Every structure is written in C-alpha cells, then in structure tokens.
Structure 1
Amino acid sequence: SNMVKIVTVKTQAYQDQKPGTSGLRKRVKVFQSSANYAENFIQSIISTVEPAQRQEATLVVGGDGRFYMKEAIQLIARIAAANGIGRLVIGQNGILSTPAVSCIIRKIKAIGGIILTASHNPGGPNGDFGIKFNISNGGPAPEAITDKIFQISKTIEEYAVCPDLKVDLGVLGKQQFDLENKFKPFTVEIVDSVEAYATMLRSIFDFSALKELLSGPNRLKIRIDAMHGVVGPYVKKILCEELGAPANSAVNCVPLEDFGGHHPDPNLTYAADLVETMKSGEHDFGAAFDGDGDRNMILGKHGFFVNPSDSVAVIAANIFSIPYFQQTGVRGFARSMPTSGALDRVASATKIALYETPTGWKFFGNLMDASKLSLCGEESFGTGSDHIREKDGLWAVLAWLSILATRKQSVEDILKDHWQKYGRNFFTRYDYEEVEAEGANKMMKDLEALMFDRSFVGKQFSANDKVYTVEKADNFEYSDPVDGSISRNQGLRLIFTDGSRIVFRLSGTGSAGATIRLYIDSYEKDVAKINQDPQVMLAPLISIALKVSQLQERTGRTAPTVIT
C-alpha cells in the first residue's frame, strides 16, 4: 500500500466551478452528489502547474475541519500524486488555519496551497464546502490564475488519480508512495497543525511579556471563542499551553465538523455566547474567530464591543508595543474604502501613508509585496499585517494582548483614550439582504447620477443639531500602484467636509438577488459626544443616507436585515 497505480478517469465537465476571491464554495451535497465535482476541480488547479515544475513542487494542504474535508484531502493527494506533484505538506488531521497555510507556504517556499474551508459559512452534511487555492507568495490565487482554473474546469475530459493511495492524516512524519512506472516517490509530510504558525508568532510577539500578562495572581482574564472552528487548537497550544492562560480561557476550541451547528462567524449575534459571558464582568478581554481563522471580534470588560474599524486604529496607534514592528518599522497602513476613517486619523498624526483600497485582499497583498504595507484592516472583522499574505484573527488578539500588557489599562479605557486623542469615528454597517436586483441596481444608478450633478458638491443635509456638507461624491475607483489594474464601480461615497462619510455598495458575494451594504461613518470631536451610543449618534447620517438614496422606495425595506 505504499506502491500504487496511476489511472486515467474519464470525467464530464461542470460549467460553474468558478473560484472567486475566496475560492470555490458549494453546498456539501453538491460535492457529494455531483460525480467527480471535486476531482475535476482539483485536477484543474494542478493543471495550472507546468509539468516540468511539478516534481520539485510542494503544495500545502489543510482546512478548517468541516464535514467532507478529510475525504477532499485524500482526493487531493490521490490526484496530486498521479499528476507528478512531488510533495504535499498537510496539517495533522487535515487541520490548518488559513493563516497557518499562508505561513507554511512562505516558510518552506511551496508553490502554493489548497485550503479546505468555506470560512464563516456553516458546515456539516447540510452546509457548505469550500476549496481555496493560494499561490507561492502564500496569498490567494489572483484572478488571472482562477480564470485559467475555471477555463480548464469547463472543458476537462479526464483526470489522473492514484485510486489506491491513502494518506494517514493522524500521524506526524513523512509518508512516501512509490508510483507504478514513476522513478521518484510521492511524499506526504504530516506536520503539527500549530507548530510553524506558533514559531512565527514567537518571533513577532513577546511571549515572555504575554505569559506574564496571562499568568498568576493579577493575570489578565480572557475568554477566547474559536466557535468550534480551526483556531481551537491554536488557542489551546499557544494561549493556554505556552502562555499560561488557564484552560477555561479557551471556549469552543475543539474543531467540530458542523461547527457545533452554528455559523463560525464572529459578530454580536453569532458569538452571542461569548458576549453574554463577557457581560458578567468577570473577564477583561474576549475574542471570537471565524471558521478558518482570518477574522476576529474583540470584546472588553462587560461586553464592550471594539468595532473592527477602531480595532485596527488602536493597534496602529500602539503598534510599537509589538516587537515585530519595533524591528521592521511601519511601512504603511491600509483599510478597505468602506472601513471607517479611524485609521486615517492615526496615520495622519504619525505621518505614515494610508492606503484606501477596494474591498478585497489582493490590494493589501500587492502593497505588502512592495514593502509598503505593515498593518491593514477591514470593517468586516479583518485585521492583518505583512507577516503573511492572509488576514490573521489570532494574530490580532496577540496584538491586543501586547497593547494591553504595555498600556496597563482596560480595553474600554484604551478606546476612550483613543477617541479623546483622535476624535471618534462612530461606525455601523447596514446590510439589506436579498433585495430584488432591479430595485437595488436602480437605487444605485439613480444615486450615482444624483451625485455626479454639478450642484451636488456643496449641498447641505441637516438632521438634528448636525449639518453635513458634501465635500466630494463619487463612484470609488482605484488605480493599483503595483499591478496597474484599474478597479471601477467600487462603491458610492458621500464625503462630508466634517470627516464623515456615507458609502453604498452592492455585495459581490451574490446570494440570490442583491444585498445592499450601507456604511455610515460619522466623525465626532466633541468630548461630550464621543461616549454616546453609536446608533444614536449615527441616526442623523442614517436619515440622510436613506433620504438621498430613496432606499425604502426602491427596495420596500424599512429596516436593514443586519446592523453591525
């Protein structure tokens, strides 16, 4: 069973195996009931590697532990072997967080990786399955490569497979497979899921300082919720075993194939258990990760909610508490365009460049690969640095713990100090889910044409005490300074003279009919206004956003589906 035949299987192409920014995501039942669905796609990824480059190539493979992952990893090995891929590096039990895969690709100079995750979407027999492809910089495959995969998948007629090859995913070490009529062996390395990632973090952060923060009498009390997803064993081996947090600090830290039956998505309703725990007042700091570990929600004593746009501003303002940045320097800051302007206040005060990018990783990774980006953030619970080429939720928690250790203040007092220094960007996102496309597209086309008229800049909108004056209004465009690409129609912005913004986007992650995302960013300098309820302070700007867009009239919605 270490010697196996290579066979050619005739297959039929599917027409919809189109990777997006985040991979190919289908319902598990589709993968199961569509013959050769996964095989076709895996073969299609590998066909993008020139045969002459396969023998010396390594692919990193792992996923978030959801149902169907181990069957898929076996299939990757069976096809990789038969196609002449020299070596796979696989996390034990198939487990690798998305940041760990990025770490390992870059550490061992793999040609890329295949991540078995649908991120924050549910899993289990009735949920979703995802297949991501990352390339040699450890980041997501860019669109030129995912298009080739899609093209290959639509006309594929056969794949090569080693049907008798079986990998033991549970034991560490090197497994070799001799292939019938092939001279060199196929090699699988099962590595510890956490080791390489933990070794990386060990050089970024001061584990001594953190261990002192988290251990003993006056320890910072923390509660970390992996939501039954991939970050679980990372929490246990790093925060508990190595840094000395008591074991009760790690909740939902055993990966479950169905993520305990819930969405592994960190926000106030999907992580309501963590929130309710934090309300008790016993713990100083709480955090939640998504299913594959690149997203994070940060909570403080009493359930104080650090909104992600503030979180990256705070890290930016205390960035040299982290030894990595002490030693590399700060090459730049970035946030997606819809993210709040809190980061800009910090970057302006410290004379560091601020990149405002369209939604999507590739803009961040481009700037990182150019040595221009050290810290980036997304209002959708994303924080990252150039230590890898994916966002990193556990990294962001360690960043926070490092800042708490040097600041010696509560999470809430750090935010109050921040807002007093930079002013506060009150922020919320309204999601209108599954609105009819005709209404939503009409709402956007009409609003854009309203904004383009000569009189729109300088117009004044008032609601209560607030007056907002239009400084600029446009449909966001981005000329990418690395790859030359021009990204257009990236979101309608109403930029007011006072620092506030309204942003409208249509979601590019198509559900079934459009979803509208309305971002409200209201800047406030007054000290008697910075400690107010955000929804109260955002109401004037929300009123204006609905009035000028005519959203209720276009869509029939009187209320968002989700407020964040």
Structure 2
Amino acid sequence: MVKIVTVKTQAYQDQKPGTSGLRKRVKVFQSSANYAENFIQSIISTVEPAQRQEATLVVGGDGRFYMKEAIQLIARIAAANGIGRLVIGQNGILSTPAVSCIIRKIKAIGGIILTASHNPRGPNGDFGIKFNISNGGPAPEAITDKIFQISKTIEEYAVCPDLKVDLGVLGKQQFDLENKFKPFTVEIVDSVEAYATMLRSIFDFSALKELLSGPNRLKIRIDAMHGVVGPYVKKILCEELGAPANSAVNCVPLEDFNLTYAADLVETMKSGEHDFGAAFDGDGDRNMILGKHGFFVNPSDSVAVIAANIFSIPYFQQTGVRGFARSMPTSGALDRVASATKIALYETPTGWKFFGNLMDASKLSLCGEESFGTGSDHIREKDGLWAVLAWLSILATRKQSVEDILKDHWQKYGRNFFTRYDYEEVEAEGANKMMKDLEALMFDRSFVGKQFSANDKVYTVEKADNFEYSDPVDGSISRNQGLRLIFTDGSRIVFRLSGATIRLYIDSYEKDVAKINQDPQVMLAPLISIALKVSQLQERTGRTAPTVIT
C-alpha cells in the first residue's frame, strides 16, 4: 500500500522560525518548490527517530488560504517519517489556544499550527508555520535554532505522495505504510470540544448562562473578525451559554480577510444597544474589551480589573493565585492591584517564553500585555476567548456596567493613563541614532534627579536604564529590552525599537479623583512632550506625529 519516497531537496537559507513561527508570503510557499516540505521535515527531524512511533503531534490552523493544503503536506511527511499519530481539528481548524489545550490534555510531543496571527489572508497574502512543544507552548530558541540549522543544510525528506486525509469527517483514519508494521493514525477531532470542555471547567457556565439569556440579560456583540475564534464563539457563547445568535458577528473563518481594526465593532457598540463588546485576532490569542457606548478598556487596565476580581473565577478559587506578570511596556495598573495583596508581580521583556517559564515554575497565574494579550496558566499560549469569559464572569458577580467597573477600579487603585505611539517605517539609521543618543544621555551621572516641568505638573527622574532581565528559570539574560525613564510619581516613559518601527509607551499615574476621569490624551500630553523633547525623535526621524495611537 502507501509507499514512502525520499525526495532530494535543495535547501533554503531564510527559514528562520522565530517566536511566532516562520511567516512568508503564500506565493513563496507555492512558487518556491519544496519550501514547506523542507521546513516540515526540519521540524520533524528534531524528534529523535526512536521516539516517533509513540509520538502524537497536534495540527490545525486559523482557516486562511493554503492551510488545508499545508496540513496535507504535514500528514504525508509525518507518516513517512514515522510519527505515529496526528490529531487534527475538523476541517483543519484549531485556534492557537485550542492547540495548546489539546497538546497538554493528550500529552502530545507538540503541535504544528498553521497561522499568521494578524496578517492578511489569501492568494496574495501571508502564511505561517508555527511549532509548539510538549508543554503546549511555543518552541524555545534552542529548538527553533536547531530547526533553522537543519533547514539550511537539508538535502532530502520523506513523504507519502499518495496519502490524503479527509479533514471533514470525525474519527480515526489509519494508513498502512509500505514496509512498515504499525499504521499511521490520524484522528480528526471536533474543533471546539476539548477547548470548550476546558473552559466549562474553568468558569461557572451556569452563572454565565444566567447572565446571557432571559429578562434583563447582558446584551453582547462578539466580533471574531473572520478569524479562527468564530466557531468557538458560536458553540460556546451562543449554543451552550444561551447568548442570542446575533451576538456573534463574522464568526465564519474565511480564507481571505489595533483600535482601528475593530472599527466595525466600535461603531456597533457606540449605538448604545449593547452592554459589552469584544473582538479577537487571527488565531485567538488576543482580545479587545469594550463597554456600553463604546467605552474602551485598554489591555493594560483589563488584566488589572481581572486581577482585582480574580476570585469570581472558579479556577482561581481552586488553584489559588501563584503570581502576576506583565511585559515591561505594559502600564503599571496591575502592579497597583498586586501591591494590595501578598502576591508577586513580575515584569518581563515582551515575549511569551518569559510567562511560560514562570508558569512552569508555579509562580505565575495571571498575565497580560498592552498589545491586547491576556492569559493564565490554564494553557501556555495567550487566550482571547478565555479573557472574554473572565470579564463576563466578573460582570455577573459585580452586576455593574463595564464603565462603572473601571471607574470603581480607578477610584480604588488610582488610574494609570496609558497610550502607545507607533512610528512605522522610520529610517533605521535615524532611529538607532535616536536610541543610542537617548541611552547615552540617560546613562549620565546627573540624569537621575533631573526634573521636567509640564508645567504645573513636575516629573522627577527616579531611574533610567536599558531594561535587562535575568530569567529565573532558564538563566538567560535578555539585554537592551527598552529605554525606561522612570519617574517618582510612578509614571514612566518607555522607548523600544523593532524599514523600522519605534514604539513609545507612556504611563501616567493619577490618584486624584478629580483627575481620573479626564481624557487620556489630555492627561498624557505633558509626558508625551517630555518624551519627544528628550529623545529628539522628530529631529532624528523627521516624524511630526505617530503613525498610530493606541
């Protein structure tokens, strides 16, 4: 039956798998012969031969064009290489938090996820291949380094050319490989079930069911933006929890699609009909939270509100709260909440690996970042739909509007006004000059102490550095992670680099009750001015304005 053939291949040189996997244009995975084949083989060749027959890999993607074709490739190469089994979501569909869930539930060696996050879908669009390891999280640098090494010097791979998988039908498919003994096994599983079952156990589905249907039900609008979370929204929020069907918009994943991307949802909330709104990104690991009339809960505040009401979530009632965490550029809203408890607050460089490590050491329960990310140690990826059900949980217990909840939070903890300026496609030379100069300035002896007037408001430098982080688990040192100007009132200016892109984060703390409900862009203006003056950004880049304000 099913023959195994060796295909001589010519290696590529730009297959570096990053933190979110390998992302290229789809016309590359199609014009470039054996481009995908090479990489899938490289990933699989990191699994020792002796461990393959007993191994299971989870496979799924975000619905984008070329996904199903890709999953077919993976099966043909997994089989010919001796991987014993694939678990694949029906139709190829699995959200990234669903994959993390399933890897951990069935103890797979890892998974291959076909997504490209927020990136455009279609023939003239992007496609990405991401590898996760046995703890359900993204492959660390050491693994992705080996895949890259293998890919650059690869000379052959193995495939089952004639092997096809019916992704439409539930159940176990088997394949008799020529000159093998044990069969290749594919399990097509319901896209939503294992994940929904996890959520069912985390949250009080009875309470949420009550909240979302009947007399004075909470009216909600959930925008999956034609991404992967769609089916998860329909099966859980509507079908199981009883939210009316029109609660769910764009919940059909399509093969071709910040604060301006959910412009649709914002307009809808702005009518004043709904009490709560939410949107998700491509693969389900990010979330935007909205209140009546379009009230914007910024991601930094959102993890803080969740932290402050965390015990209205059954999961945390039972497992307890092992720690809090945020990325360094996220606002210090969370810190104010952690400060009123006995629970540690870790501040990490941007990146998942840092959270995952603290989680794996039983030191982190809740984590968030300013880039629309919220998560917990229930899995090892960020979880957008989970964040929404945490909020609904909080709403059902608090019984107040979303805006009244933030107002109460700000009155208790003070407010951390936050914004992020993006400057996109700036000339690298100018930006790097800007960073190198600003750091040199900051590093001077008589810089700590230096004052800056708004005026009226006066800020004083408490600390200024290029953020470093020793990871308490892997021991790694992460250097040059962002310029931080830290002020004595608990306000911060942060610069990061990533043509090029500058990110300016501004975090202004206000405790005054007559100041906490003012317009953020007005309250932030003095620190923004200070930021631009000290960095000489307009002078170094030519930009009189950011590309995007969040």
Q: Aligned ranges for residues 94-493 of structure 1 at < 5 Å? A: 94-259=92-257, 267-493=258-484
Query: Once the two structures are superposed, what CA deviation does each residue of 1:12-57 show, in whole Å capped at 9, x if it has no partner?
Result: 1110000111100001111111000000000000000000000000
Kindly state the Cα deviation for residue 371 of structure 1 after the two structures are TM-superposed. 0.3
Secondary structure at the aligned position of 2:113 is classed as strand
Deviation at residue 102 of structure 1 after TM alignment? 0.0
Name the counterpart of 2:488. 497
Whole-angstrom distance in 1 between the partners of 2:456 and 2:73: 63
Residue 530 of structure 1 and its aligned partner are, at CA, apart by 0.5
1:248-285 deviation digits (Å, cap 9, x = unpaired)? 000000000112xxxxxxx3211111000000000000
Instruction: Output the CA distance in 2 between the equivalents of 1:458 and 1:177.
Output: 71
SS in 1 for 2:440: helix
| Count of residue pairs the alignment pairs up | 550
Tell me the alpha carbon deviations over residues 422-475 of structure 1, each in whole angstroms, 9 at most, x when there is no partner. 000000010000111100001000000100000000000111321100000000
Q: How far apart are residue 5 of structure 1 and its match?
A: 0.5
Mark the runs of 5 or more structure 2 residues left unpaired by the alignment.
Answer: none
Task: Provide the rounded CA distance (Å) in 1 between the counterparts of 2:528 and 2:106.
Answer: 49
CA distance in 2, matches of 1:145, 1:427: 36
User: What per-residue deviation string (whole Å, max 9, x for no partner) do you get for residues 495-529 of structure 1?
Assistant: 000000000000xxxxx921000000000011111
1:388 Cα offset (Å): 0.1
Which of 515, 530, 533 aligns to 1:547? It is: 533
Structure-2 separation of matches of 1:310 and 1:558: 28
Deviation track 1:322-372 (CA, whole Å, cap 9, x = no partner) reads: 000000000000000000000000000112100000010000000000000
Q: Which residue of 2 aligns with 1:77?
A: 75
Please list every run of at least 4 consecutive aligned residues from structure 1 whose deviation after the TM superposition is greater than 3 angstroms.
Answer: none
Point out where structure 1 has 5 or more consecutive residues left out of the alignment.
260-266, 507-511
**Could you tell me how far 1:181 is from its partner in structure 2?**
0.5
* Larger displacement relative to structure 2 (301-310 or 267-276): 267-276
Question: Which deviations, in whole Å up to 9, do the C-alpha atoms of 1:409-428 show, x marking residues without a partner?
Answer: 00000000000000000000
Deviations 1:356-410 (A, max 9, x none): 0001000000000000000000100000000000000000000000000000000
Matching of residues 31-110 of structure 1 within 5 Å = 31-110=29-108
Given the two structures, how large is their TM-score scaled by the length of structure 2?
A: 1.00
CA RMSD of aligned residues (A): 0.6
Alignment match of 2:514 (pick from 509, 513, 528):
528
Query: TM-score normalised to the size of structure 1?
Result: 0.97
Give how far 1:115 is off. 0.3
CA deviation vs aligned residue, 1:65-99 (integer Å, no higher than 9, x gap): 00000000000000000000000000000000000
In 1, the alpha carbon distance for the partners of 2:271 and 2:56 equals 48
Q: Name the CA distance, whole Å, in 2 between partners of 1:271 and 1:314.
A: 21
How far did residue 106 of structure 1 move? 0.1
Distance (whole Å) between structure 2 residues aligned to residue 49 and residue 513 of structure 1 = 37
Structure-2 separation of matches of 1:125 and 1:555: 35
CA deviation profile, 1:108-154 (whole Å, cap 9, x unmatched): 00000000000111111111101100000000000000000000000
Q: Secondary structure at the match of 1:4?
A: coil
Residue 193 of structure 1 aligns to a residue in which SS? coil
How many Å apart are 1:161 and its aligned residue? 0.1
Aligned partner of residue 421 in structure 2, secondary structure:
strand
1:514 matched to 2:505? The reply is no
Structure 2 residue matching 1:153: 3-state secondary structure: helix
* Partner Cα distance (2:195, 2:157) in 1: 33
User: Which SS does the other structure have where 1:334 is aligned?
Assistant: strand
Q: Determine the C-alpha separation between the residues in 1 that align with 2:3 and 2:520.
A: 63
How far apart are the structure 2 equivalents of 1:187 and 1:160? 17
Aligned counterparts of 1:17 and 1:245: Cα–Cα separation in 2: 44
| Distance in 1 (alpha carbons) for counterparts of 2:220 and 2:289 | 11
Give the Å deviation of 1:60. Answer: 0.1
Per mean C-alpha deviation after superposition, the further-off stretch among 460-469 and 62-71 is: 460-469
Query: Residue 524 of structure 2 aligns to a residue in which SS?
Result: helix
Give secondary structure in 2 for the equivalent of 1:274: helix
Percent pairwise identity: 100
Q: Give SS of 2:27's match.
A: helix
Q: Secondary structure at the match of 2:7?
A: strand
Q: Following the alignment from structure 2 to structure 1, what is the Cα–Cα distance between the partners of residues 92 and 545?
A: 42
Q: SS of 1:350's equivalent?
A: coil
What SS class does the counterpart of residue 544 from structure 1 fall into?
Answer: helix
Secondary structure at 2:201 match in 1: helix
How far did residue 287 of structure 1 move? 0.2
Structure 2 CA distance, aligned partners of 1:10 and 1:464?
Answer: 69
> For 1:491 and 1:226, how far apart are their aligned partners in 2?
32
Moved more, 245-254 or 460-469: 460-469
Corresponding residue SS for 2:340:
helix
